[PDB]
Design a protein around this ligand. Structure first.
Ligand SMILES: O=C(O)CCC(=O)C(=O)O
Ligand SMILES: [Co+2]
Length: 228
């Protein structure tokens, strides 16, 4: 079913009806006028960040290149393969860019320190996929450029999601959400879920340990805030 959308909810309402019970929600009217929303574009990103080295996930492999190289090879014209500038603390690397975002006010409802919030960039072409997985903190995923299809499964459904059998990968599902092998993973079929298309200016709250799967529908840039 579709993740609910709420316009600038009060801190207390967000706390009591979403944060405490661990229910996903899309926050509207919160990040829609952050400077990033109008400023970020390929040319702006090239100008500020183009010369800096970033990690890039290819496919599968992990490599390093400049932001300019990443754009040239994996976004513009006709890329040969899928590349994704994923899960990278770009704003620690480039303080000038950090000026264009801010910490959502709702994070102050947490028990953690603002200092310790981890801010990651997620920048890539249409078609990037983050396989179904869960993270150990709360998340606000802020969509800046393009749209993403997102599937969400509650931590209560973990037994239908066939986590990998190693410590290192136990927070990742073995299932390919959009083409599941139901012969091998039959329990996946019956597990309920939420989904949405997250659009520019919107924030998705992903509760701590909620399983999420994400596919970019367009050239996309998202910023996540992992907080407690
Ligand atoms: O946007 C994506 O591809 C994945 C984002 C994600 O997993 C996160 O913010 O924790
Ligand atoms: Co995640």
């Amino acid at each position: 079913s579709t993740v609910p959308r709420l316009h600038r909810p009060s801190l207390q309402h967000f706390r009591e009806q979403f944060l405490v019970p661990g229910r996903p929600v899309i926050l509207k009217g919160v990040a829609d006028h952050w400077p990033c929303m109008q400023k970020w574009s390929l040319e702006y990103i090239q100008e500020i960040a183009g010369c800096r080295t970033v990690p890039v996930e290819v496919g599968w492999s992990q490599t390093l290149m400049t932001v300019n190289e990443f754009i040239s090879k994996y976004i513009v014209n006709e890329p040969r393969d899928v590349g994704y500038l994923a899960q990278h603390q770009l704003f620690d690397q480039i303080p000038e860019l950090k000026q264009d975002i801010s910490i959502p006010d709702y994070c102050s409802l947490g028990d953690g320190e603002e200092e310790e919030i981890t801010i990651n960039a997620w920048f890539g072409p249409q078609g990037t996929i983050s396989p179904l997985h869960q993270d150990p903190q709360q998340n606000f995923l802020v969509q800046v450029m393009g749209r993403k299809y997102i599937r969400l499964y509650s931590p209560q459904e973990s037994g239908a999601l066939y986590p990998h059998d190693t410590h290192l990968l136990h927070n990742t599902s073995q299932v390919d959400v959009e083409n599941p092998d139901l012969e091998k993973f039959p329990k996946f079929a019956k597990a309920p879920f939420l989904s949405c298309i997250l659009s520019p200016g919107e924030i998705l709250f992903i509760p701590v340990k909620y399983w999420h799967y994400v596919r970019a529908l367009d050239l996309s840039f998202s910023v996540s805030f992992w907080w407690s």
